[PDB]
Amino acid sequence: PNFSGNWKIIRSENFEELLKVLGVNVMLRKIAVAAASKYAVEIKQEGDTFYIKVSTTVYTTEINFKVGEEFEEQTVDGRPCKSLVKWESENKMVCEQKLLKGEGPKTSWTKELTNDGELILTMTADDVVCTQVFVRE
Numbered sequence: 001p002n003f004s005g006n007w008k009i010i011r012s013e014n015f016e017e018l019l020k021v022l023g024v025n026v027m028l029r030k031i032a033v034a035a036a037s038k039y040a041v042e043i044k045q046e047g048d049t050f051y052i053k054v055s056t057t058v059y060t061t062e063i064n065f066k067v068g069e070e071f072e073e074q075t076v077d078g079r080p081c082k083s084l085v086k087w088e089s090e091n092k093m094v095c096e097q098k099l100l101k102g103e104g105p106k107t108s109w110t111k112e113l114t115n116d117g118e119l120i121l122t123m124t125a126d127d128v129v130c131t132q133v134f135v136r137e
């Protein structure tokens, strides 16, 4: 549907706790939380093909996928992984990830477009769920 847009963050909950589960030490967690306050998501959607560009003040990364096809990206804490996105309803998709090398927490994310025009992202590591809410620029 209309995931396409330039999204700007308005709320971020449990992000520090997510990073803690992921092994990031406290000073870097605090700096990462501060960096999440500037952060923007740009989405281009055509059918079930998505282009996503995530950017903060000094860093930017692009994610390209088709729903239902495995692709490679990185976990939140930077460990490369294989990902697979599926729809869960009209305007929510869920991505499951598997580490390429090694072991670690089970991670995943979801992206939802609400009826009131917000984008909700969740990122999960084991039992900890980070929720971020965006509005269009």
Ligand SMILES: *C/C=C(C)/C=C/C=C(C)/C=C/C1=C(C)CCCC1(C)C
Residues within 6 Å of the ligand: 032, 035, 036, 039, 041, 052, 054, 055, 056, 063, 075, 076, 077, 109, 111, 121
């Ligand atoms: C569909 C939207 C997705 C998959 C968004 C992914 C977002 C990230 C991988 C954000 C990561 C960040 C850090 C790892 C620390 C700096 C702040 C963030 C939130 C940009």
